Amino acid sequence: SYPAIPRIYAETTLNMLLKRAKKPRVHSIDEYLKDGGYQALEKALNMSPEEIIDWVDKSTLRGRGGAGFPTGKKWKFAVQNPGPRYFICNADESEPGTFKDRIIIERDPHLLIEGIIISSYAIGANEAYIYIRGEYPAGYYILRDAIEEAKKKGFLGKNILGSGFDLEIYVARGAGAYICGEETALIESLEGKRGHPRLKPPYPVQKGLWGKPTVVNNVETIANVPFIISMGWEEYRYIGPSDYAGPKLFPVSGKVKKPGVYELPMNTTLREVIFKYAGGTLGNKKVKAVFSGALDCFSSEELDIPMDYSPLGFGGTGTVIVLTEEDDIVEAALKIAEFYEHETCGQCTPCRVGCYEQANLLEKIYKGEATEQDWEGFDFVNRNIQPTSICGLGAVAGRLIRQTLEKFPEEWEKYRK
Amino acid sequence: MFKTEFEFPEELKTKLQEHINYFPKKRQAILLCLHEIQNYYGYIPPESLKPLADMLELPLNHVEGVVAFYDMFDREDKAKYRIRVCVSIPCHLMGTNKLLKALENILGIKPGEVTPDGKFKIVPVQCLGACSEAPMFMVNDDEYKFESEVQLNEILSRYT
Ligand SMILES: Cc1cc2nc3c(=O)[nH]c(=O)nc-3n(C[C@H](O)[C@H](O)[C@H](O)COP(=O)(O)O)c2cc1C
Ligand code: SF4
Ligand code: FES
Ligand code: NA
Known part of the structure; x- marks a missing residue:
């Protein structure tokens, strides 16, 4: 029994991040386990932290939170500094047009949790946080419940699967400030303060929560990590363009026939997102512009760009707000x-x-x-x-x-x- | 003229202690506490900050700065149910105006106003992260897409 949420349409060509999250309901731990869940965690705990960082590095996984920074390289910066260390999942998602993170949280929370556990082990963090915006109350309660389910199965707590690795995941809530999504502001809020960004550098990996080495990663980024461990880094790289590997979630909104979240490889063009997958525009009106959330504006002459992190790519979070000729x-x-x-x-x-x-x-x-x-x-x-x-x-x-x-x-x- | 000193009822206080015990440090619970207080009273009582600060083991001015920074926390108005209406893009393209109008028709109030009854307040907010299902609004923690005035009226009737 959770607060009411809208039914966001979801579709996938890769059947990875949205294997379960394409269906609009909460997938609990029994169902997650049946689909092979928490096996990647067990395999990861049989590996060394250093090996996991290496796999994530070699996978070429980049941040899904907007900046596109290489995830492996970020983790390596953290571990070059003495512990203790903290891991933070960023679930603030408050940019116009952007609703990709919520469908993972609300429908497949254990995918996110598995990724957090693996990621925390990789960087030697025994304390982990999810910071979820306050306007996602169902997500908060769903996560709290899923974390307790995971604890009861022995995937969280002390001595996880006999590994001797200890982890607790805490869920914090935002309170209506977009800025709290900025990583240093997020950390300030976790310390019980106003969400005021800090001068960077230093980066959180050097000085973060309580001044300690801290990794902050986006929900979507972390959801990739179980797959990298499960498939191995090389098979992961074979997904999509050689340069920009892995599945990507594209929240598509505005005047399209089929607004929702699409899991697609990053060699997909913006035109294909809108016309092939989102079904074209309402009334078959011509596309005037696409807003990449609140970050960029693309004209109709720029629809053939790839949805990747190249110089000429769409970039950002893959947020696609479509405006027609009439708007x-x-x-x-x-x-x-x-x-x-x-x-x-x-x-x-x-x-x-x-x-x-x-x-x-x-x-x-x-x-x-x-x-x-x-x-x-x-x-x-x-x-x-x-x-x-x-x-x-x-x-x-x-x-x-x-x-x-x-x-x-x-x-x-x-x-x- | 006389006023009673402020105390939290026991049911609410128990939840506040729960949040305070939840994180490794007490002061990390501040936002969970404020969320809890606002849902309980329909707002943040000015008197409530001092007792909260003591539970969080923080100076009062710290808590005051936090409440001020997060303007969603409302010290001015008491309202049982907050109707948060997305006034962002692309909701504006999909009929936020219609929703606002229907709200005005049904409840007789405009964004930022409270009913004389004191049960409903319309709060204009930025993107709610439900853009595919625009136009979007929330009633407290529940969230819905607006279809029509009759549809809206039925949803609102559930809150009493
Ligand atoms: C104003 C502002 C808001 C941001 N909001 C978010 C957000 O809601 N979620 C997020 O993951 N990153 C957000 N970011 C980016 C983070 O600071 C950071 O780059 C990211 O969380 C790191 O995770 P990633 O490497 O997995 O992308 C924001 C950045 C800025 C400047
Ligand atoms: S830290 Fe400075 S640049 Fe960033 S949001 Fe605040 S005022 Fe703007
Ligand atoms: S613009 Fe209204 S939910 Fe995003
Ligand atoms: Na959902």
């Missing part, structure tokens, strides 16, 4: 501006004032109330949110909007009128 780009830009207005933590002055002014000036532009000075101010503010910024939000708060100005000048000019 106003300025209106959409306003919504992105409003997002950053609401989410800036306020530590840095240009970010604090810039995010505010970007949204407020854009609102006036949208309502046809903007003076000529408002237009000049909007342009200036958009370009000056980043100075002095200590985290990624300040660096990207004007990125998507600037791209709309560059890619849709004709549409912006009508608001100039």
